[PDB]
């Protein structure tokens, strides 16, 4: 499923990401935009055999299990296929765990590059929440 900008902001707010660990809502919307273009089906295979899954491009060597990643961890304790659902709940719950890792949203390269330090509120401007 490809979410609309405001449609995604609404779902993430529902799921409690607004100001989660101090990150206002637009941070998460901006992260999804550049990580997956708001597509819950986005997958990107990496040279190490791992794959990034879903709306927030969560990696199979550390966060979920896709059975193709040899000696990997599964820190969110879920099958990576769970991160490809129309329902972003699994992705949001795992993202909460990732952002509680010790470095906040810096764990997302795309957020660090395209969102960190910008006017993230613009990503929710014009939306009804």
């Amino acid at each position, epitope marked *: 499923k490809v979410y609309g900008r405001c449609e995604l902001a609404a779902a993430m707010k529902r799921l409690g990401l607004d100001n989660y660990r101090g990150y206002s809502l637009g941070n998460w919307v901006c992260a999804a935009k550049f990580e997956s273009n708001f597509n819950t089906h986005a997958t990107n295979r990496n040279t*190490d055999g*791992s794959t990034d899954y879903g709306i*927030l491009q969560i*990696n199979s060597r550390w966060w979920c299990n896709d059975g193709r990643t040899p000696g*990997s961890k599964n*820190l969110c304790n879920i099958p990576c296929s769970a991160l490809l659902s129309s329902d972003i709940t699994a992705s949001v719950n795992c993202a909460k765990k990732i952002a509680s*890792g010790g*470095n906040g949203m810096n*764990a997302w390269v795309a957020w660090r590059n395209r969102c960190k330090g910008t006017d993230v509120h613009a990503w929710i401007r014009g939306c009804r929440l």
Partner: nanobody
Amino acid sequence: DVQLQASGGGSVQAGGSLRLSCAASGYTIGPYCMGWFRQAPGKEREGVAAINMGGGITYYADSVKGRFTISQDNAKNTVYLLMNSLEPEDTAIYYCAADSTIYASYYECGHGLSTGGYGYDSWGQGTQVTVSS
């Protein structure tokens, strides 16, 4: 409260080889990246080699490609830097470093290596390497 302990180093004649080692302890999860940076008195600090602990993909400064090799024991959160065909220009204080961030999406450890050490948050005390003529 993680610690990076390095071994190896010292003096060696040009053309010679040295292997440095660095063990990361105190981690429960991670580190995500381990690498070596070097600093010679009158130069900019240089990222020499790095490796994604998860996966083993490696990265190298152009100045050492084909001469140096970084690898991990993994089983013990330890990495090795095998340096062959040393030149006097390789003389420097070599530092083991690590990036403790567990990234959400795939991250190439060579990025922080080539951009000033960005993301490498933990550092060893430095090991002198002197390559004599």
